[model samples]
Target: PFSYLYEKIINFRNTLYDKGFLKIKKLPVPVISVGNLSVGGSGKTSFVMYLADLLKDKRVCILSRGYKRKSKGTLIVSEYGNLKVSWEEAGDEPYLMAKLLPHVSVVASEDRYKGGLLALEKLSPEVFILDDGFQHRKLHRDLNILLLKKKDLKDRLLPAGNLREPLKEIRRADALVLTYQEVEPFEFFTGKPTFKMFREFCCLLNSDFEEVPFDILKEREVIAFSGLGDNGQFRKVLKNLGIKVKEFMSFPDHYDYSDFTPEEGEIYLTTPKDLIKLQGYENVFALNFKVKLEREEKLKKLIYRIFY
Candidate 1:
């Protein structure tokens, strides 16, 4: 017990700026980071999207570390030039970002410093948004937008609690956002200008670059399964639409579906990451979800004020 407690104390100590700590040199170009205090499902990606839309008229690029991706660093996805990159090549978030934000450039690298440098030099972007960069203090940021999931706080970190750091870490953010499917622990997030978000699965499949609503799947009873950060949001969407979800299966976030075996229903529905890890499993549909929240204009203004 002392060993573990000692490690935490060490961690807390390490968090304090190192004496003669390399003063991280920041880019003159504005950079906004959307990150979380918790491990997963804190709505960082969705929050980043809100930022992207605000800066749509201006040239913008997103830099992600490509977590769980096999590649080591610096992969680019662009609209002007063709670069052959799959989910395995660029990771799930980049692939998803490239597909969804067609006009905006998306880049992935484990090394945020190198990635940020490359994006600026190559893309000549006016504004850059870094996804999940709160913990990476080595790379300087202009604004730190941190997110929290009301539901995930009760859970423990990796092997113990869900938090990467303590709740006081929220104070470090330039702003704080609270995302949840349900607001059970709303009290914990009071005082801050907190906003709530939910996943809206608008389509069974993307057809001709358009979303087909839940009404189209009226005739089918499908088993919904998701290995994303929160499977509750995915299943809840189906339940709200009166879909007969025969069974719901949840695995760890970004869990590869190699071990999954469908018990009932003709089809299995999963998140995009799980779909890729499935390696061509027939009758498996990847559920594409948009991170949605209200008062989006307010969020845009906050980012604009920080970066512009």
Candidate 2:
């Protein structure tokens, strides 16, 4: 399969870097990369937000390759755009990240090294967090954290399975964080530092509209739709929160919602990132999440070893 070949190319590329055949630029300050082996909905944005919050009060900036944006190479997402940004201008994920964490400086560039330079020059942030930059080999990072999900790793590559790269490439990570509640006993990670993380709707912080209690919708029975990695998690959260989810609708990650229509009494809800693709729709709400990781000490020590 092409995915297998693509992975071979990546490992070969890393070997070249390790052998000095390729060059990797090092940063003076520490860099933490929040990325995943599988594409889409592995919670990279949420993980980045968690890291930003963990390092809150410390100066921080984020760099993303800005997938799906109509604009070329590099562009910063800000309030300058006529409509802030069209989903066509900035990808759904980056735009949502910018909107969610307004306090954290965010820059998007195909050339992450250039983006890091710009962030360093302009913000001089104490720490840099790279969003979804796993295969970005040219830029050297101080610490690499891999987000792995049970379903994603077992699946095949593009047109076949969900894995963008092979499983062996996961070793490139300094530490691995499993995203689901269930554990995948992949012997590949034995002896390597690993952490178990759970993703659930801890609370509702609707920065897009207002900071409202998640229970506001508990009284209504409605439809839930998402263009994200797993709608199952979203449905589980709704049920756990005592919200009545009459129907569950799902589309592939980054699904353009131009064709979506919401029926009445059937209130619609989606992920904050998905809202970017659906503009001017009333009664549509997105559940903002606060992802918390357990075993703080272990992760802290692992990161310290890598970066500190």
Question: Which prediction has the highest lDDT against the true structure?
Answer: 2
> lDDT values of the candidates?
0.68, 0.72
TM-score of candidate 1 relative to the true fold: 0.82
lDDT of 1 by residue, 88-188 (tens): 77777776666667667888887776776888887888777888888777677888877777655665444466677666667667777776654233535
TM-score of each: 0.82, 0.84
lDDT value for model 1: 0.68
Give the top-scoring candidate (TM-score). 2
Off by over 4 Å in 1: 1-14, 18-22, 79-83, 152-158, 182-191, 206-210, 256-265, 275-290
Residue pairs in clash, model 2: 156-161
